[PDB]
PDB file of C-alpha atoms in Angstrom:
ATOM      1  CA  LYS V   1     -77.003 112.491-116.591  1.00 50.34           C
ATOM      2  CA  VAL V   2     -77.002 115.729-118.589  1.00 52.19           C
ATOM      3  CA  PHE V   3     -74.187 117.887-117.041  1.00 52.79           C
ATOM      4  CA  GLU V   4     -74.376 121.621-116.893  1.00 51.40           C
ATOM      5  CA  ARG V   5     -71.334 123.278-118.540  1.00 49.36           C
ATOM      6  CA  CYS V   6     -69.416 124.580-115.473  1.00 50.87           C
ATOM      7  CA  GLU V   7     -70.317 121.528-113.423  1.00 51.89           C
ATOM      8  CA  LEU V   8     -68.651 119.357-115.951  1.00 52.91           C
ATOM      9  CA  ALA V   9     -65.610 121.584-116.241  1.00 51.09           C
ATOM     10  CA  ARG V  10     -64.985 121.401-112.550  1.00 48.81           C
ATOM     11  CA  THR V  11     -65.508 117.609-112.527  1.00 47.95           C
ATOM     12  CA  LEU V  12     -63.016 117.080-115.409  1.00 45.53           C
ATOM     13  CA  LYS V  13     -60.455 119.290-113.643  1.00 39.83           C
ATOM     14  CA  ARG V  14     -60.626 117.206-110.423  1.00 37.49           C
ATOM     15  CA  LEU V  15     -60.263 114.114-112.519  1.00 36.93           C
ATOM     16  CA  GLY V  16     -56.960 115.506-113.786  1.00 38.00           C
ATOM     17  CA  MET V  17     -57.850 116.180-117.360  1.00 38.33           C
ATOM     18  CA  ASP V  18     -56.409 119.690-117.629  1.00 37.43           C
ATOM     19  CA  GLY V  19     -53.223 119.368-119.794  1.00 42.44           C
ATOM     20  CA  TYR V  20     -53.461 115.548-119.924  1.00 46.66           C
ATOM     21  CA  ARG V  21     -51.146 114.444-122.803  1.00 48.91           C
ATOM     22  CA  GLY V  22     -50.912 118.192-123.676  1.00 50.33           C
ATOM     23  CA  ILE V  23     -54.690 118.614-123.956  1.00 48.80           C
ATOM     24  CA  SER V  24     -56.239 121.613-122.302  1.00 49.42           C
ATOM     25  CA  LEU V  25     -59.449 121.443-120.307  1.00 49.60           C
ATOM     26  CA  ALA V  26     -61.302 123.580-122.798  1.00 49.97           C
ATOM     27  CA  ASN V  27     -60.501 121.172-125.509  1.00 49.71           C
ATOM     28  CA  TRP V  28     -61.977 118.277-123.533  1.00 49.53           C
ATOM     29  CA  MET V  29     -65.022 120.451-122.898  1.00 49.32           C
ATOM     30  CA  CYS V  30     -65.409 121.249-126.603  1.00 51.73           C
ATOM     31  CA  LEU V  31     -65.136 117.510-127.413  1.00 52.55           C
ATOM     32  CA  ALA V  32     -67.872 116.455-124.855  1.00 52.27           C
ATOM     33  CA  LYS V  33     -70.108 119.222-126.090  1.00 51.71           C
ATOM     34  CA  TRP V  34     -70.037 118.187-129.703  1.00 54.47           C
ATOM     35  CA  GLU V  35     -69.932 114.492-129.187  1.00 55.33           C
ATOM     36  CA  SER V  36     -72.844 114.127-126.695  1.00 55.30           C
ATOM     37  CA  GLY V  37     -74.156 117.451-125.527  1.00 53.13           C
ATOM     38  CA  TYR V  38     -72.693 116.653-122.126  1.00 54.96           C
ATOM     39  CA  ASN V  39     -74.992 113.539-121.941  1.00 49.65           C
ATOM     40  CA  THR V  40     -73.567 110.449-120.269  1.00 47.36           C
ATOM     41  CA  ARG V  41     -76.231 108.103-121.612  1.00 50.08           C
ATOM     42  CA  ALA V  42     -75.892 109.048-125.271  1.00 48.50           C
ATOM     43  CA  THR V  43     -75.264 106.165-127.642  1.00 48.88           C
ATOM     44  CA  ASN V  44     -74.877 106.188-131.376  1.00 49.10           C
ATOM     45  CA  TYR V  45     -74.928 103.051-133.527  1.00 47.34           C
ATOM     46  CA  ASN V  46     -72.810 103.160-136.669  1.00 50.64           C
ATOM     47  CA  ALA V  47     -74.737 101.008-139.021  1.00 49.62           C
ATOM     48  CA  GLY V  48     -71.926 101.312-141.529  1.00 52.11           C
ATOM     49  CA  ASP V  49     -69.448  99.308-139.564  1.00 52.62           C
ATOM     50  CA  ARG V  50     -71.549  97.784-136.772  1.00 53.20           C
ATOM     51  CA  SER V  51     -69.815  99.542-133.917  1.00 54.50           C
ATOM     52  CA  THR V  52     -71.414 101.847-131.301  1.00 54.19           C
ATOM     53  CA  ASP V  53     -70.182 105.109-129.658  1.00 53.12           C
ATOM     54  CA  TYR V  54     -70.881 105.341-125.964  1.00 52.82           C
ATOM     55  CA  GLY V  55     -71.169 108.035-123.406  1.00 53.32           C
ATOM     56  CA  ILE V  56     -70.175 111.559-122.807  1.00 55.06           C
ATOM     57  CA  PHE V  57     -67.059 111.250-125.019  1.00 52.30           C
ATOM     58  CA  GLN V  58     -68.717 108.901-127.507  1.00 48.75           C
ATOM     59  CA  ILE V  59     -66.063 106.219-127.144  1.00 45.47           C
ATOM     60  CA  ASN V  60     -66.084 103.585-129.914  1.00 44.39           C
ATOM     61  CA  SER V  61     -66.736  99.874-129.307  1.00 43.71           C
ATOM     62  CA  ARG V  62     -64.341  98.687-132.045  1.00 42.21           C
ATOM     63  CA  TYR V  63     -61.258  99.505-130.017  1.00 41.14           C
ATOM     64  CA  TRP V  64     -62.059 100.851-126.619  1.00 41.04           C
ATOM     65  CA  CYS V  65     -64.739  98.965-124.667  1.00 37.30           C
ATOM     66  CA  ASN V  66     -66.386  95.593-125.036  1.00 38.31           C
ATOM     67  CA  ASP V  67     -70.023  95.351-126.086  1.00 37.38           C
ATOM     68  CA  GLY V  68     -69.768  91.812-127.416  1.00 39.75           C
ATOM     69  CA  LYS V  69     -71.584  92.643-130.616  1.00 36.55           C
ATOM     70  CA  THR V  70     -68.953  94.487-132.552  1.00 39.82           C
ATOM     71  CA  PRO V  71     -67.112  92.259-134.973  1.00 38.06           C
ATOM     72  CA  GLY V  72     -63.382  92.069-134.731  1.00 38.97           C
ATOM     73  CA  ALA V  73     -63.132  94.484-131.912  1.00 40.61           C
ATOM     74  CA  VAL V  74     -60.763  94.971-129.034  1.00 37.87           C
ATOM     75  CA  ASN V  75     -61.237  96.462-125.652  1.00 39.20           C
ATOM     76  CA  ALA V  76     -58.237  98.663-124.922  1.00 43.51           C
ATOM     77  CA  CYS V  77     -59.847 100.273-121.930  1.00 41.77           C
ATOM     78  CA  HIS V  78     -60.561  96.915-120.359  1.00 39.87           C
ATOM     79  CA  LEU V  79     -64.137  97.910-119.634  1.00 40.87           C
ATOM     80  CA  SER V  80     -67.603  96.848-120.493  1.00 38.76           C
ATOM     81  CA  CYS V  81     -69.171  99.559-122.721  1.00 39.51           C
ATOM     82  CA  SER V  82     -71.940  99.666-120.107  1.00 39.48           C
ATOM     83  CA  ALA V  83     -69.450 101.433-117.836  1.00 42.24           C
ATOM     84  CA  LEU V  84     -69.416 104.404-120.125  1.00 43.31           C
ATOM     85  CA  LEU V  85     -73.135 104.963-119.691  1.00 44.61           C
ATOM     86  CA  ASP V  86     -72.995 105.673-115.981  1.00 42.25           C
ATOM     87  CA  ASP V  87     -73.773 109.038-114.432  1.00 39.99           C
ATOM     88  CA  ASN V  88     -70.389 108.903-112.653  1.00 36.52           C
ATOM     89  CA  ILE V  89     -67.782 109.683-115.362  1.00 35.30           C
ATOM     90  CA  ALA V  90     -64.786 108.188-113.652  1.00 34.73           C
ATOM     91  CA  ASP V  91     -64.393 105.249-115.989  1.00 35.20           C
ATOM     92  CA  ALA V  92     -65.256 107.242-119.027  1.00 37.64           C
ATOM     93  CA  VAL V  93     -62.475 109.758-118.162  1.00 36.96           C
ATOM     94  CA  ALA V  94     -59.972 106.980-117.525  1.00 38.52           C
ATOM     95  CA  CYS V  95     -60.749 105.469-120.908  1.00 36.11           C
ATOM     96  CA  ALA V  96     -60.615 108.795-122.713  1.00 33.98           C
ATOM     97  CA  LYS V  97     -57.145 109.203-121.161  1.00 31.66           C
ATOM     98  CA  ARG V  98     -56.287 105.876-122.700  1.00 34.57           C
ATOM     99  CA  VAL V  99     -57.524 106.832-126.119  1.00 35.44           C
ATOM    100  CA  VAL V 100     -55.257 109.947-126.181  1.00 36.46           C
ATOM    101  CA  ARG V 101     -52.173 108.002-125.224  1.00 35.53           C
ATOM    102  CA  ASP V 102     -52.103 106.690-128.741  1.00 36.15           C
ATOM    103  CA  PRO V 103     -50.381 108.666-131.576  1.00 34.21           C
ATOM    104  CA  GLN V 104     -53.394 110.616-132.829  1.00 36.88           C
ATOM    105  CA  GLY V 105     -54.173 111.980-129.353  1.00 34.92           C
ATOM    106  CA  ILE V 106     -57.400 114.001-129.354  1.00 33.56           C
ATOM    107  CA  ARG V 107     -57.442 113.949-133.195  1.00 36.94           C
ATOM    108  CA  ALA V 108     -58.787 110.405-132.927  1.00 33.22           C
ATOM    109  CA  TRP V 109     -62.221 112.080-132.703  1.00 32.66           C
ATOM    110  CA  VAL V 110     -63.170 113.648-135.986  1.00 37.21           C
ATOM    111  CA  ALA V 111     -65.635 115.978-134.390  1.00 37.25           C
ATOM    112  CA  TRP V 112     -62.760 117.556-132.431  1.00 38.23           C
ATOM    113  CA  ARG V 113     -61.076 118.397-135.752  1.00 35.11           C
ATOM    114  CA  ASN V 114     -64.252 119.772-137.214  1.00 36.15           C
ATOM    115  CA  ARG V 115     -65.491 121.782-134.364  1.00 35.98           C
ATOM    116  CA  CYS V 116     -62.678 122.472-131.990  1.00 37.65           C
ATOM    117  CA  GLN V 117     -59.272 122.464-133.613  1.00 40.56           C
ATOM    118  CA  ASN V 118     -57.899 125.914-134.390  1.00 43.43           C
ATOM    119  CA  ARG V 119     -60.850 127.611-132.818  1.00 43.96           C
ATOM    120  CA  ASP V 120     -61.127 129.912-129.892  1.00 41.68           C
ATOM    121  CA  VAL V 121     -62.329 127.311-127.330  1.00 40.45           C
ATOM    122  CA  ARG V 122     -62.176 129.589-124.337  1.00 38.92           C
ATOM    123  CA  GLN V 123     -65.985 129.876-124.247  1.00 36.95           C
ATOM    124  CA  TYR V 124     -66.341 126.314-123.013  1.00 36.02           C
ATOM    125  CA  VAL V 125     -64.735 127.060-119.684  1.00 36.10           C
ATOM    126  CA  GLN V 126     -65.442 130.694-119.301  1.00 31.51           C
ATOM    127  CA  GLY V 127     -66.678 131.741-115.861  1.00 33.24           C
ATOM    128  CA  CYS V 128     -66.505 128.240-114.389  1.00 33.01           C
ATOM    129  CA  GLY V 129     -63.824 128.802-111.845  1.00 31.46           C
ATOM    130  CA  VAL V 130     -61.311 126.316-113.336  1.00 33.48           C
TER     131      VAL V 130
END
């Protein structure tokens, strides 16, 4: 599923992501935008280390979900990576909440640093009613 901007914003709010571990909604929105274009089926294979990024938040198979083919990986979210490719983002949101409970928080995603940190991210939720 390819979410529309405001549709996603309202979904993420109901799922309790606004202010989760100190992270504003707009920041989550900026992260989904740059990681997958708001696409829940996006996947990106990292030939360099043999892991794959899955879903709307591009969650990595080395630590977060199990895909069986990543060497030396763990599955902190206790999910199959297939779960992160569903049109319903419930499991993807629960896993993203897990990723940010670790020290780095949202900084775990480099694209957030490049494209969202220290920027005016208000545009991502503007006019959406959240």
